[model samples]
Target chain A: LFGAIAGFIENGWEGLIDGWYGFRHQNAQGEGTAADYKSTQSAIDQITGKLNRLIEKTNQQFELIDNEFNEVEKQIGNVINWTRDSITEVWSYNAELLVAMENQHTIDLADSEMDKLYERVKRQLRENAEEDGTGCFEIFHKCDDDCMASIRNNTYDHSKYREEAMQN
Target chain B: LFGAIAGFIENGWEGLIDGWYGFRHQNAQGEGTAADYKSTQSAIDQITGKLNRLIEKTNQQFELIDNEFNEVEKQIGNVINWTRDSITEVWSYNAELLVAMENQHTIDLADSEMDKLYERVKRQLRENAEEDGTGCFEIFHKCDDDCMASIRNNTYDHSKYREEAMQN
Candidate 1:
């Protein structure tokens, strides 16, 4: 539920405000056709859902691979026998290796899909997001600054949204 | 030197600390294997340099495009029209369009390379950052909390570094 708001605020409401709000004000917004927005938003919804789920699953693996090991019993004797030696350190380190190996495998499988969906949503959003910032409230405040600045800032915002979102 | 710091930080300071400090500490702290950590850091350094350069170059283009048309002028009509539609607004909008168009093109060109790099880097940096009850930190802290959070947070602070350096 929170993800929906986040996905919308990050990807949806801000996009609509940047691209259409101003044009709409001037009636220069043209015919965006609710169908187009709906289609794109639907795709974004799915992408965000998959992405959110991916993070949760990945973190779950993080917990399992790094922290769940029980080796104190096995290492206590070794630690004392070696005059405060640190033989247990290698064992613990190797334990994380197990997690890293599993993580690498999971990453190999899932990263590509996440990246693809991320780009798809961004491109689709950009197709609909590009527009004059003539009357956007954000633009209005920044206008003393300059239109090119505002637009450039916003365009860059869109350009890199996908990379940032997916941690690409 | 700064790039190296960013590279180290992005890749994980643990990589540097391990090589400089001690392997035992790194391992005990769940830093994973030294070799793997170094390899991952190298990959991050390579990718971040590329992404930063590309993004900065794009920003330069925006500035250049803006400078192309923005000019100082003296005229009553310009002033009268200034209240209605200033020259700043007009030239700025055109520059904005150029930037918007170029950014779209840039994204298209780099889409494939960025996707592959993103997958590799994400795997390398996943869950590697510092985290507390406040939330995730380090690279993962930045990636998950800032870059991906979208609405609840602002964009990444990387460019701000550039600007602070008096480069932007």
Candidate 2:
């Protein structure tokens, strides 16, 4: 009986020690401690870093897209300016051409009128010639008697015509 | 002595069994067995789905960007066409203005010449009339007898003057 009692006391002491060990170990699975929490936090930090990298990369892509949009806008503005410049040039040239052609027509008409007047004067002089080759042509024509004499004598001075007409 | 040996064998056996149990539960600390692999696959699938969704959304955005480019092209074409149309209108108006102004100049010059000729002829006729308002005035002028009579009678038909001169 004494040996049995001693064995019971020894077993109780062992159970208490085993209980303390089991408490320290927590379970057969694992010792739930701060180490697990630290590892899980490390994994969460890694995932967060990856997510931040991805966000940064996406931001760079967005910046490139914005640059592309700006480039497109610049191109569109250039095209618009080109169109404006072309239209302006066309209108300017059109005005110049119009003025040039109109002036040419005026010059041609004036030449034709001058020719007809000269022809009329020539016919009149041919028909109504006086005895000394000095007719009444000077009364209506723009030339003076000396100019008429130069024309009749075939000594027309083209270089001095302006001064001569001015004097007349 | 037998009891002591039996107790030692029993303790050894219990320790071996506990070690085996620990080995079986080692998966709680992320042993990376089939369960972990399946969960990882599930996470990968979820991430893949998210990535696919992002890709699809980005594709849609790309399509919109492409359409915007197309719209820009269309607008540029329209601007070019507007320039073309503006230039065409300017050219057409330039031609018309040129012709109109030239014709006006021609008409004015012709009328001026005709007026001067008529004045000279009238003066000559008045100065050297033969009899009853008849003179030798047909030599230098381009007018018919009836046209001359209308001028003497102060009745002129301006529109018929061109054809009458041509006929004469």
Candidate 3:
């Protein structure tokens, strides 16, 4: 259900909102259509664009952080673990690498948090006890829990693979 | 205008739409109050929760991506680049690093695209030219161009900063 939202967030925030609400609004300077977004094969163009943007932005940010790392690296030059100790720090450091590692560490958390939030939200919705008192609502029976298993358990989910009133 | 919307997506998707139209539709197995979302502070409890979730998530994601980098780091890993070129790829590989750096990159582009979409949407709304001789609609001029600057320049943005009658 949410592989796509993650995809959406990856795709862009505007894409998410535009996809949901649409392109007809107050600040537009020109014209467009719903199909503009609806039929977009973002994999080819948008994704590529995003990748470029990603690389470019990181390079810039890395430059800033890396400069600081570089000066430190230069001062340290090459120092080996002459110490008999099993543990030793590397002679040189790479800020980009450090940030990259930190970045991964961060997303690792994002992944976990996203899942737990999903579980909690689902459980909470069920506990709310709607329609038949099964903790489910009275919308599209086809999409009960599965379609919105990510977060929403929308009863009226219109997806092709919707579930019916098999509420547990 | 979009400040709250950002607040929504952050609040959670279930929260987003449940606030958007209400919780009377499908996928939902139970009943919820629009007021439930019509009023809430992600900052208070939700933000803290998201932060913990964020930290926890990244820790795990980091653990996996960080591991592969570690092995290469262990065996003969201490060797420094004797004569590194202008660019030297680090021995370590952090997939999560790329993902998150990429996510930041993702948001950067979203900022640009979101701006374009807002301009285009705003312009298009006027080109629709409903009920008025001017390109601007008779809705709330109070929110004309400023309210939805993030991506949507909604003609009828109900934000306190809404503009009306004013058209560029």
Candidate 4:
């Protein structure tokens, strides 16, 4: 009789367990999260593509700008590459600048000259990048924001500006 | 009267310019979008920190796991370095994985293999790691979750289980 009752209880417990099985976090498989990640990656890739195109368009404007600055310079392409590299490097080094600034707050001050130089360089880029015919500055600003917003909010369209950008 | 009309028009234009000013993003130097960029940088740094900590914890666990499985052939801490190198390789191959998963859609098929191998390795580690009275399986599940979630959410708390785990 004791064995029979124990078996009955065990069977009932198993039934309850079975009922609760697979009832964990609905997102345990990371389905929604994975979709969100995928969406974000797609948006980032799209923005990156747009940014590259902007770089190319800027390259054209770069030639124009260089022409306005100097008509006989043969290394216009190299100059443009160097300028783009400078902007990329400036963006990258901003991280270090911030770190140094924080450290300065605790200890010695970072060189104000360096800070002013970075500001001037970035300011120059923003001003010049905007007027480069493609309104590349406006597109860049919007693209930068949309990339980040898509990453944070998990909703975005890949070719959102397909008609505007003439992207397929 | 013409001078008065010109003055009135100039004042209206000034009002419009003032309204338009400070509408565009500016950086911390009251320059170009500095404050927003700073906050984004901080957020990215936080995610980087979580990933680093997760890597460290995983390295510790694998080191212990390998030490247990050495059977006099593998040296102590061999697995620790192996774990570190493995993660570094994964990070190096991140671009390939992203391309494969995103563009090629190969992740659907590869995901099954990935899941199986992940579980098998985890099981093997659990068996060995449990020799020291460690709940490695549970810890690994949590670690995998934290790593990915940290990268996804840009937030993580390493000290979460400190008080509880400190009982050891």
Q: Between candidates 2 and 4, which one is better according to TM-score? A: 2
For residues B26-59, write the lDDT of model 3, one tens digit per residue.
Answer: 1223332332221233223433453455454324
Q: Model 3 over residues A5-108: C-alpha lDDT tens digits?
A: 35323433354444431212112243332222322332235345534643532231111212344452533332322321211232134455565665564444
- TM-score per candidate, in order? 0.18, 0.26, 0.21, 0.13
The interface root mean square deviation of candidate 1 comes to 35.6
Question: What DockQ does each prediction reach against the true complex?
Answer: 0.01, 0.08, 0.02, 0.01
The residue-by-residue lDDT of candidate 2 on A3-83, one tens digit each, is 221222232224432221111112234332211232234334534653453242212111121133355577766776676
lDDT of 4 at A28: 24
For residues B1-168, write the lDDT of model 4, one tens digit per residue. 011111111322233332211112212333221112333344346546544654533343322444444453432243334434544544544444334334322222232232333334334433222111110123322234434333224343445534443332
Question: How much is B100 displaced in model 4, in angstroms?
Answer: 8.1
- After superposition, the stretches of candidate 2 with alpha carbons farther than 4 Å from their true spots are A1-72, A121-126, A130-168, B1-81, B94-168
Residue A48, candidate 1: C-alpha displacement in angstroms? 16
Residue B80 of model 1: what lDDT? 31
List where candidate 3 sits over 4 angstroms from the true fold.
A1-91, A95-168, B1-104, B107-168
Better of 3 and 4 by lDDT: 3
Evaluate candidate 3 and give its CAPRI docking class based on DockQ. Answer: incorrect
Would candidate 4 be rated incorrect, acceptable, medium or high by CAPRI criteria?
incorrect
lDDT of 1 by residue, A1-168 (tens): 112222322333344543221222222333331122332443356446535533522121111111125533345334333522343454466447645754553333233332333333333333223323221222222122232333322333333333333332
